[PDB]
Design a protein around this nucleic acid. Sequence first.
DNA 1: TATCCTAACCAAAAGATGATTTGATTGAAGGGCTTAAAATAGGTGTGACAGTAGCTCGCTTCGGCAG
Length: 178
Amino acid sequence: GPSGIVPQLQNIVSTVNLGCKLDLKTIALRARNAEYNPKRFAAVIMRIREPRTTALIFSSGKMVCTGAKSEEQSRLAARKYARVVQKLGFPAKFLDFKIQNMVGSCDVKFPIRLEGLVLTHQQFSSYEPELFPGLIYRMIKPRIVLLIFVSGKVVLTGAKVRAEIYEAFENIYPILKG
DNA sequence: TATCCTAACCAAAAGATGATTTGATTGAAGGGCTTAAAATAGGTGTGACAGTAGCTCGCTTCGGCAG
């Protein structure tokens, strides 16, 4: 069962369609937090402090946001960006919001011998300290990928909802323990 | 005496014992990646694709007579 350590999400990724054509130069010109360098890439970057997120605009009518601590918070950040775009004069809308990715991390408070983890589970766990100290572990139920380290801390990524990260942690905990 | 030994000591060669200064090492931080995923958005170059690029028979010529 659980050890009292609940995995905590550190990032969310989400996108939404603005539903209208936009001009990147106009956004960069009229907005304070907007960043635009067409010589490098054809998109505008947006930053706000509450939520603590980073997002982008594209002329084809697309918006992406990331950096939030929860999917509801990511939606709030996206809607704030949509409001900013609307008040800048574009006829934007908040259409087809989708959560794309969310990351989590946890710990077990005991060492994990990665040698044992690889030599019992070589079929889906890949271990290669030289380029990456941690052990890389992919899984099917749910479609998640993990990073397991010597200290016992684990990073979880690829989920759409916190339930997936929780159940992934519960699935791996008996493997981590023994 | 004129000098040498070497108790005790001055001057110096050298031999040693410790205190201070400076060359060398490294502790931690400036820093700056990392694979794992997930995503929208994009620009074009270029590199494959293809194409062309030791012995025994047969055959020929130009005179030397024929007609």
